[PDB]
Design an enzyme around this catalytic site. Structure first.
Site, PDB file in Angstrom:
ATOM      1  N   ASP A  70       0.809  -1.233   0.000  1.00 22.39           N
ATOM      2  CA  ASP A  70       0.000   0.000   0.000  1.00 22.39           C
ATOM      3  C   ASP A  70       0.834   1.272   0.000  1.00 22.39           C
ATOM      4  OD1 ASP A  70      -2.425  -1.478   0.136  1.00 22.39           O
ATOM      5  OD2 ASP A  70      -2.355  -1.418   2.364  1.00 22.39           O
ATOM      6  N   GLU A 197     -11.281   6.373   5.752  1.00 20.98           N
ATOM      7  CA  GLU A 197     -11.642   6.295   4.317  1.00 20.98           C
ATOM      8  C   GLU A 197     -13.058   6.831   4.070  1.00 20.98           C
ATOM      9  OE1 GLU A 197     -10.689   2.244   3.316  1.00 20.98           O
ATOM     10  OE2 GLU A 197      -8.594   2.792   2.882  1.00 20.98           O
TER      11      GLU A 197
END
Ligand SMILES: *[C@@H]1O[C@H](CO)[C@@H](O[C@@H]2O[C@H](CO)[C@@H](O[C@@H]3O[C@H](CO[C@H]4O[C@H](CO[C@H]5O[C@H](CO)[C@@H](O)[C@H](O)[C@@H]5O[C@H]5O[C@H](CO)[C@@H](O)[C@H](O)[C@@H]5O)[C@@H](O)[C@H](O[C@H]5O[C@H](CO)[C@@H](O)[C@H](O)[C@@H]5O)[C@@H]4O)[C@@H](O)[C@H](O[C@H]4O[C@H](CO)[C@@H](O)[C@H](O)[C@@H]4O[C@H]4O[C@H](CO)[C@@H](O)[C@H](O)[C@@H]4O[C@H]4O[C@H](CO)[C@@H](O)[C@H](O)[C@@H]4O)[C@@H]3O)[C@H](O)[C@H]2NC(C)=O)[C@H](O)[C@H]1NC(C)=O
Ligand SMILES: *[C@@H]1O[C@H](CO)[C@@H](O[C@@H]2O[C@H](CO)[C@@H](O[C@@H]3O[C@H](CO[C@H]4O[C@H](CO[C@H]5O[C@H](CO)[C@@H](O)[C@H](O)[C@@H]5O[C@H]5O[C@H](CO)[C@@H](O)[C@H](O)[C@@H]5O)[C@@H](O)[C@H](O[C@H]5O[C@H](CO)[C@@H](O)[C@H](O)[C@@H]5O)[C@@H]4O)[C@@H](O)[C@H](O[C@H]4O[C@H](CO)[C@@H](O)[C@H](O)[C@@H]4O[C@H]4O[C@H](CO)[C@@H](O)[C@H](O)[C@@H]4O[C@H]4O[C@H](CO)[C@@H](O)[C@H](O)[C@@H]4O)[C@@H]3O)[C@H](O)[C@H]2NC(C)=O)[C@H](O)[C@H]1NC(C)=O
Ligand SMILES: *[C@@H]1O[C@H](CO)[C@@H](O[C@@H]2O[C@H](CO)[C@@H](O[C@@H]3O[C@H](CO[C@H]4O[C@H](CO[C@H]5O[C@H](CO)[C@@H](O)[C@H](O)[C@@H]5O[C@H]5O[C@H](CO)[C@@H](O)[C@H](O)[C@@H]5O)[C@@H](O)[C@H](O[C@H]5O[C@H](CO)[C@@H](O)[C@H](O)[C@@H]5O)[C@@H]4O)[C@@H](O)[C@H](O[C@H]4O[C@H](CO)[C@@H](O)[C@H](O)[C@@H]4O[C@H]4O[C@H](CO)[C@@H](O)[C@H](O)[C@@H]4O[C@H]4O[C@H](CO)[C@@H](O)[C@H](O)[C@@H]4O)[C@@H]3O)[C@H](O)[C@H]2NC(C)=O)[C@H](O)[C@H]1NC(C)=O
Ligand SMILES: *[C@@H]1O[C@H](CO)[C@@H](O[C@@H]2O[C@H](CO)[C@@H](O[C@@H]3O[C@H](CO[C@H]4O[C@H](CO[C@H]5O[C@H](CO)[C@@H](O)[C@H](O)[C@@H]5O[C@H]5O[C@H](CO)[C@@H](O)[C@H](O)[C@@H]5O)[C@@H](O)[C@H](O[C@H]5O[C@H](CO)[C@@H](O)[C@H](O)[C@@H]5O)[C@@H]4O)[C@@H](O)[C@H](O[C@H]4O[C@H](CO)[C@@H](O)[C@H](O)[C@@H]4O[C@H]4O[C@H](CO)[C@@H](O)[C@H](O)[C@@H]4O[C@H]4O[C@H](CO)[C@@H](O)[C@H](O)[C@@H]4O)[C@@H]3O)[C@H](O)[C@H]2NC(C)=O)[C@H](O)[C@H]1NC(C)=O
Ligand SMILES: CC(=O)N[C@H]1[C@H]([C@H](O)[C@H](O)CO)O[C@@](O)(C(=O)O)C[C@@H]1O
Ligand SMILES: [Ca+2]
Ligand SMILES: [Ca+2]
Ligand SMILES: [Ca+2]
Ligand SMILES: [Ca+2]
Ligand SMILES: [Ca+2]
Lengths: 388, 388, 388, 388
Positions: A70, A197
């Site tokens: 990531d 998020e």
């Protein structure tokens, strides 16, 4: 140009129509398409574009090996024309890093990228394509943000950040930016117990964000922001139609003010539109993995702890891979109401397709219709065998 | 900008000159050219561009296998600069789907794309690069449209759609759009018995469309539209110079108000310019397959059931593959008259060249001259052997 | 914008400086570079660009086999940014054909392309990116034009065409265009006996063209055009410094009014600047082939039948391949005088390098300096062995 | 537009944030990325771009063999969008040559490129994308310039050139340009004994340049220019924190007016910001090779011969390759002060990685923050093994 104000309500959502689709993995089997993940869509007053985090390699390139990871020094927020793929030659870098958000305020665009090692990350806030403000990590544990567009009202663009644990309490902050400068920030308040998020939209001078409780909740936390007072609330979607992933099976009654249990320490970015009887929730079809995607009309999901679907639409069959999903709208369209839109990240490669050494995605995106339109399913469409 | 009005008549057509040619299959043997089919040409006030339906893969890409198929989730209407090829890096997506039309009204462009499964398709009408209106299938059988440009007059842009059988009566509708909104629609009237894939042009406040009667006719149906009254008529081209494909040999006397028989359940998109003694018809040279292409001057073809050619021009020899053909004009050119133009799709690969696994095309395009110019032939030019 | 007028004289040419170079063959060994030949340079008021005739294939593509041939249906006039290579993705097609010229008049650009079979060719004259006028072959034998830029004065842009034999008398015409329309044309007059491929420049309301006498002359014909009266003269460069190729060795005294003999039925496009003592001639170094390139200062070359060099500059060593050369100037630059410029086509591949199956070129281009600058040589730079 | 004036002071530098990074070598393993070296960054009023000297080949191309060499006919100054890689398709050529500088004056851009053989080189000065002035070699020994941006004040853009020996006294000149024309030039004065490759910035109507003394000094020479009087001074950075490479170990006391000895006839381009207590020096970490890169806060480095660091930031670990470094600022940003920026060239391939036959680089770039931000390291990121 004047700053955009959130003056309109949402259009009535009676179905979803195809808006954009880039076919990036199909096309990148034999063209110079960047490896991406964490895509989104965001509009300027004169154009809408696809956004994502590049991995700094093409998908056929040898440097695609290892792209499951990531966070690296080789990631950047890129944007490119709607429904084209993210190519080496057409992708515009917005900023460097491995977590992002971006939004236009009506005058120009703010883009934010976070970079650094896990214990020493920093956000850089760009405005009008120049760096303006920087924010250091406050909790020394993967400072991170929305991975989809922010929303602005009269120049004030709130952004949700988290720093701290993914598997226990963390330190979430709502920053209120104007022209890339910090007006104010607040710590998370309300009953959401963990936030990551956030997927946001605006209507009638209010911003609604549907987020990911990675730690405990299979229902989604919701933050609602007043961008004039610069204040917010938080709770969970009350409905028993659970929308994180992985998740337990749907119960009969949900939880409004705490995480619905059964799954810990995981999740996926997702979204909703929460508008009374005009409420639609997105979710993966699978309860176990990022597989399939559907929209469900769930009247009063936010407030009704027994609310069940009254209509739906399949977007991706459960025999196809999905991924993150998020909200955006074209706040500069014609007409009397804002048309809800969303995207779904169609993840290909690792970890689910481990015969290749890369991880990438394509995008599909839809917007609402007031008609009751027929449904298709919209897979990525690439064949992994071709990449071996 | 004001809406364009169809104020001019057609220029006198004494021959045809080369306008554009993209050499897409030659070039895409070793560059990142998208697989396409169903191309066309359409002008804005400041530029003319090539359009087509992408298949969401390059021609050298492994995903080109299977591109004979007409309808998938990986198709999109794309446009690109005149005579360049449709590349991954220069193609602009207009909308997602597998049947299309597009036209500029003088202020901005309307583009329409249909997608979905065969029994559940829907049209999305974009205006100024934003979705505005949606239309669901009315007959649940491959809703479909022109595959070449529409034409506008004072902001009203008629579009012909069909939904229903390809091999019996279907449900054709003429929609009248303005700013992407539906003003009116009408069912087909007149004596045309089946309509598909209309090729249209405008002159003196009238729009003429030459279409494909897939079911029965080897003569072509013609729809003539008054975009002010928003009304239309239909008939067939009367001439015994038959212009569909496949077709029987030319007779001595045609049919004005019914399909000329001999070939059922097949056809090709084509076009004509129907202007009294200034009438020119396009056709394949072969009566059996999409092979060759010629223009024939056939005075009063529309109305004279014995009319035969008085002049012609070969465009593609009968030893080269052709395909669809359609009309367009630059309604923003200088001068006193509109210059007729057309394109021919040069199909390569399947089914006629089955040593490759793909189907694609290139484009050639011509416009009229008032001179009597010498003729060349304009093949695609690629060598299939190079692709094996 | 107003039409440009040729109000200035030439700057004093004391040496030549590097202006542009595209390295196209080097770069196209591993990128999507089109095969070209017959390049040139031409300026708009805000940009200067490279131009050439594409062959409708990349240089690594299999369709590059056979590109020695001059005339096919797959050629087009393309332009691209100064010093970039002509790529599939950055090349703009101006028009379709296999012989061209182009020039800006101060308001917009005229481009002309000729296509067709040898006995039935036609010119299409584009203005403001639209076709305006067409001219049919008058002699049925490869209608053909300059292969470098035209020059305009108060909207009048003369262009030299030839139709007829390459090895005997032909029919040369000077057309005077304005806004793409024919004002007048005249047959060649004067003492030039054969004209091809004129290279032109303008100064003080006169256009001077240096051409190729393919039939007989190793000295070059010169046409001087008054674009106001729309009249012209022709003669040959008088100097014994002979500038066609192939050619005999230089004599002591040249010919002003007839072709200097020794070589028949061949030549190369070239150029000069003819300005009294400020006269510079270009030529290949070799007398036998398109090898090397030099500039020679030859005071009064046009008029003095004994004039010899007084200064020079090597551009391409005689151990490197050259090709066509031509004139252009930036008529929109700042200052009191027009700076002379030229380009040289650096031909690679067939027929001189026949281990490859293609023919292509790169470009080098220089402009004059009032300094006495040091000289380098400017080869193409590619290694043929890499292409095997 | 008006000419930019240097009205602001430097912002307080408390750390450095990521600004741009192109990942060019990673991406160019499988895309059409040009081989470069000697990169830099420069801003226009509306955009900032990456610049470098191309080698006229892609990195996968066979012509990449031999690109260790500094000077060929195949080099050019190119620019491309910030953080994209320098590709064949997105790189704009500014001018042709093998040594460069460029800067915007607020109205338009001046770019300078030097070309030629070592004994006969010449500079061409372009302004508004046109050639304006030329300068011949004065010492016949590799005329050469900054390899990073120049700086302008009220239209006057000083540029530092050197011609002559790299291993003894040379002839350095400061030219003062306006609109590409020479206002004045001066020979180097002051106590710097050798100057190459100056890295410049402006603040409060003064231009400061930190250069490379190739001949003798491991401390860096500094030229300070008054662009109004058109005069300058020179000295060395006094600090014992030595910043050239290779270099001896750091002493306790430096040299203000002569070169600090220990290493002869070598160096690297580098930079500093010299602003009292707000002074930051860049350097390689290694004393032996272009390995690692760090910023050190060295209060009063210019004037204090005992000054040592008080703070620092690692940019590239000493286990990664670095290269040239230079200064630039966005003189058109909002706010009250100019934010210091720099870039580091990350050289890959020869001579340090000689399993490949090429030499190229990528770019990382940072700007200052008033926060004390966490640090990451920013390597090139490509794996040489992939290129074998
Ligand atoms: C061409 O395109 C067309 C347009 O797309 C297409 O039509 C579309 O078809 C699809 C598919 O059929 C439709 O989508 C589905 O919609 C369902 C909802 O609609 C039904 O239900 C409502 C509501 O009914 C209740 O309530 C009303 C009033 O509120 C009452 O009148 C009813 O009697 C009933 O009351 C009971 O239930 C209530 C509690 O729920 C109680 O309050 C009450 O007291 C009673 O108990 C009806 O109104 C609908 O009827 C109308 O529409 C139909 C047409 O669809 C007409 O025929 C009819 O005449 C009416 O007009 C209708 O009956 C969704 O439920 C459905 O989604 C579920 O199923 C899919 C799988 O198919 C799952 O993936 C999805 O997640 C949902 O199920 C899961 O979740 C629920 C919620 O928790 C669980 O209960 C369930 O078990 C399941 O859980 C499992 O799976 C989960 C996911 O994996 C997992 O997480 C769980 O843990 C668990 O394992 C789906 O969205 C769509 O709406 C149509 N659209 C339109 C406009 O028609 C057409 O087919 C196409 N044509 C062709 C030829 O292809
Ligand atoms: C350089 O470039 C130049 C420019 O391009 C180029 O010149 C061009 O040459 C081409 C090729 O020759 C020309 O194109 C052809 O044009 C033909 C038409 O022109 C002829 O006919 C007319 C009309 O003549 C009748 O009518 C006038 C008055 O109306 C009378 O005066 C005549 O006497 C005659 O009358 C009879 O017929 C009528 C019924 O039709 C009755 O009413 C009447 O009572 C009589 O019975 C003439 O006017 C023309 O003359 C003028 O032009 C010529 C030059 O061409 C001059 O020499 C002359 O002096 C005049 O000025 C001329 O005679 C087209 O017919 C032709 O197309 C057919 O043939 C091609 C094949 O070649 C087919 O592909 C095409 O489909 C057409 O045939 C098919 O279809 C018809 C119609 O149904 C069928 O009848 C026929 O059998 C055939 O069918 C079969 O094939 C079909 C297709 O596969 C299939 O579907 C069917 O089922 C079947 O199997 C062609 O277009 C072009 O016009 C020239 N252009 C110009 C400007 O000159 C030049 O050559 C180039 N130079 C070089 C060196 O290369
Ligand atoms: C750094 O960069 C610098 C800048 O580039 C560089 O300097 C440059 O050097 C080059 C190379 O030396 C120079 O280029 C050459 O220039 C020559 C011209 O200059 C010479 O001649 C003139 C003229 O001299 C006559 O006239 C004056 C007055 O008008 C008189 O004063 C003279 O006495 C003499 O008079 C005689 O001749 C006349 C007839 O021609 C009669 O009228 C008269 O009565 C007498 O008979 C001089 O003025 C020059 O002097 C000045 O400059 C020099 C410096 O060059 C100073 O040292 C000096 O003090 C002065 O200031 C000088 O002497 C060109 O002739 C030459 O081109 C020919 O040669 C090349 C090969 O080298 C050929 O390729 C080219 O084609 C030419 O030769 C062919 O063609 C001629 C014409 O027909 C033929 O005669 C000849 O045989 C040959 O033909 C053959 O080859 C042909 C081609 O293949 C073929 O087609 C034929 O068939 C045949 O086979 C060349 O261009 C350049 O000018 C310099 N530039 C400058 C600014 O200095 C410097 O070197 C670089 N530094 C380093 C370290 O590298
Ligand atoms: C998250 O991110 C954070 C932000 O990036 C990160 O924090 C950062 O950490 C890094 C790494 O630690 C810091 O960078 C280093 O900074 C050092 C400077 O700071 C120290 O020193 C100062 C100055 O101290 C003197 O002076 C003050 C007053 O002026 C006095 O109070 C002191 O007592 C002391 O006085 C003595 O020295 C003077 C002469 O120098 C005399 O005048 C005096 O009389 C005394 O003798 C302190 O103020 C600092 O303290 C403050 O900050 C620390 C935090 O860092 C706090 O803990 C503390 O409480 C204070 O607030 C601090 O102590 C640099 O020196 C250092 O750079 C050298 O080392 C690196 C290697 O690590 C070399 O690469 C570099 O080149 C430098 O060393 C070379 O060069 C010097 C100079 O010649 C040589 O002396 C030395 O031997 C060495 O030479 C060798 O290597 C060369 C290179 O290869 C070679 O060329 C030579 O030849 C030779 O071989 C480095 O930059 C950074 O500043 C932090 N930033 C911040 C904001 O905190 C954090 O760690 C991250 N978190 C995690 C978890 O990762
Ligand atoms: C690039 C090159 O090799 N050029 C050489 C040419 C060619 O080989 C032939 O002309 C081809 O037929 O031959 C020469 O004798 C000449 O013509 O002056 C020498 C020159 O160096
Ligand atoms: Ca490739
Ligand atoms: Ca969760
Ligand atoms: Ca039919
Ligand atoms: Ca000749
Ligand atoms: Ca040194």
């Amino acid at each position: 140009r004047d700053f955009n104000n959130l003056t309109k309500g949402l259009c009535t959502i009676n179905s979803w129509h195809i808006y954009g689709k880039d076919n990036a993995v199909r096309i990148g089997e034999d063209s110079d398409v960047l490896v991406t993940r964490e895509p989104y869509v965001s509009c300027d007053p004169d154009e809408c574009r696809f956004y994502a985090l590049s991995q700094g390699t093409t998908i056929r390139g040898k440097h695609s090996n290892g792209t499951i990871h990531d966070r690296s020094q080789y990631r950047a927020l890129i944007s490119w024309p709607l429904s084209s793929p993210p190519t080496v030659y057409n992708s515009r870098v917005e900023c460097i890093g491995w977590s992002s958000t971006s939004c236009h305020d009506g005058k120009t665009r703010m883009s934010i990228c976070i970079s650094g090692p896990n214990n020493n990350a920093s956000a850089v806030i760009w405005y009008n394509r120049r760096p303006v403000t920087e924010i250091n990590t406050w909790a020394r544990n993967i400072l991170r943000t929305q991975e989809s567009e922010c929303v602005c009202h009269n120049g004030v663009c709130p952004v949700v950040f988290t720093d701290g644990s993914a598997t226990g309490p963390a330190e979430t902050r709502i920053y209120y930016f104007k022209e890339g400068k910090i007006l104010k920030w607040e710590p998370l308040a309300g009953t959401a117990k963990h936030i990551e998020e956030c997927s946001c939209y605006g209507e009638r001078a209010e911003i609604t964000c549907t987020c990911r409780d990675n730690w405990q909740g299979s229902n989604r936390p919701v933050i609602r922001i007043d961008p004039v007072a610069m204040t917010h609330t938080s709770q969970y979607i009350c409905s028993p139609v659970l929308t994180d992933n992985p998740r337990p099976n749907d119960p009969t009654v949900g939880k409004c003010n705490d995480p619905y249990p059964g799954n810990n320490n995981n999740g996926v970015k997702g979204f909703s539109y929460l508008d009374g009887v005009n409420t639609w929730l997105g979710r993966t079809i699978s309860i176990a993995s990022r597989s399939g995607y559907e929209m469900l009309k769930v009247p009063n999901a936010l407030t009704d702890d027994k609310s069940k679907p009254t209509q739906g639409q399949t977007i991706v069959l459960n025999t196809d891979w999905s991924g993150y999903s998020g909200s955006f709208m074209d706040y500069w369209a014609e007409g009397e109401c804002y048309r809800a839109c969303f995207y779904v990240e169609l993840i290909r490669g690792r970890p689910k397709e481990d015969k290749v050494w890369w991880t990438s995605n394509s995008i599909v995106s839809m917007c609402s219709s007031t008609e009751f339109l027929g449904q298709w399913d919209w897979p990525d469409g690439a064949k992994i065998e071709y990449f071996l």
